[PDB]
């Protein structure tokens, strides 16, 4: 069994999950992954632009 933290709200809190099937496509959906990386739609430029400097020197 895998024991994982619940969605907790800010100011027990565990839940147990056991996978019962032989395929990994039968597992319940991920919803605990909150990873991001904005800087490739937001700052796709080749040379770094520093915020405090003018963009075009």
């Amino acid at each position: 069994a895998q024991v994982s933290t619940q969605k907790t709200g800010a100011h027990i809190i565990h839940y147990t999950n056991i996978n019962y099937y032989k395929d990994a496509a039968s597992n319940s959906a991920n919803r605990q992954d909150f990873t991001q990386d904005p800087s490739k739609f937001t700052e796709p430029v080749k040379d770094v632009m520093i915020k405090s400097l003018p963009a075009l020197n």
Binding site: K7, A10, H11, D23, A25, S26, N27, S28, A29, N30, R31, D33, F34, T35, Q36, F41, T42, E43, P44, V45, M49, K51, S52, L53, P54, A55, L56
Partner: protein
């Protein structure tokens, strides 16, 4: 976990650093905080971007078609379903998946099957509970042509048998595609001559779902209806796209009719 950035205090400034000026002559969008145009205060900020993931965005079930079929042929409903799988029938589920160019995911198909009696001249009508079969024929298999034939033996085809009154039947469909992701927009043609079908419908080829009443027809007959629901899981969506502005026309094309960018205003200055 994921949480929003904190606002950080700053005092007045009068320096030769300009955060506010930028040049949007580049793809680089400004990265200014509200801590760069006015003083602000330290706010420890606990908001989470936890419902704006792509596995919370896309991970709710949505209807994708209903097919009707009858136990007596009510009015051109045949005695079995048939429906070539695609996500393009609706404008709900479709729009959210045409907001990404490529998606790989593992569906959960849930069927919600209901029935109602027909208008008929039959009297003293009592029917036992119906059992419905839902068969999935992967592309290139044999296809049924009648309510009873050899194709419904389900010798290797996935099939669900379900009896009314029980909970909706569901199953998981793993990521099954030739590609390394499903393609939501294809700019090519089927042929190498740039002829034949154009668009995403060239690549679409996901088989066909048939369904029928297992039970032999009763005197009154019924009309059943099946609603298919897809719920993505384990979703990785690559390459975002602007969402649609226009109403769809067809389920094999993107054809559109020219439509307004935005709703009216009286003037430039409106309160």
């Amino acid at each position: 976990m994921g949480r929003v950035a904190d606002t950080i205090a700053r005092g007045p400034s009068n320096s030769e650093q300009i955060p506010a000026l930028t040049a949007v002559e580049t793809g680089h969008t400004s990265q200014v905080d509200p801590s760069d145009t006015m003083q602000t205060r330290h706010v420890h900020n606990y908001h989470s971007r936890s419902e704006s993931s792509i596995e919370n965005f896309l991970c709710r079930s949505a209807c994708v078609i209903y097919i009707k079929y009858s136990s007596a042929e009510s009015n051109n409903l045949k005695r079995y379903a048939e429906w070539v799988i695609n996500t393009r029938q609706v404008a709900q589920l479709r729009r959210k998946m045409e907001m990404f160019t490529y998606i790989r995911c593992d569906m959960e198909l849930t069927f919600v099957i209901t029935s109602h009696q027909e208008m008929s001249t039959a009297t003293n009508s009592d029917v036992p509970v119906q059992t419905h079969q839902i068969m999935y024929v992967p592309p290139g298999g044999p296809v049924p042509t009648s309510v009873n034939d050899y194709v419904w033996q389900t010798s290797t085809n996935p099939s669900i048998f379900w009896t009314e009154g029980n909970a909706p039947p569901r199953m998981s469909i793993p990521f099954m595609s030739i590609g390394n992701a499903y393609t939501m927009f294809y700019d090519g043609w089927s042929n190498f001559s740039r002829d034949g079908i154009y668009g995403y419908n060239s690549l679409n080829n996901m088989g066909t779902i048939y369904a029928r009443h297992v039970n032999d027809s009763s005197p009154g007959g019924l009309t059943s209806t099946i609603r298919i629901y897809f719920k993505p899981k384990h979703v990785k969506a690559y390459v975002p796209r602007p969402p649609r502005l226009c109403q769809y026309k067809k389920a094999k094309n993107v054809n559109f009719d020219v439509e307004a960018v935005t709703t009216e205003r009286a003037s430039l200055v409106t309160t």
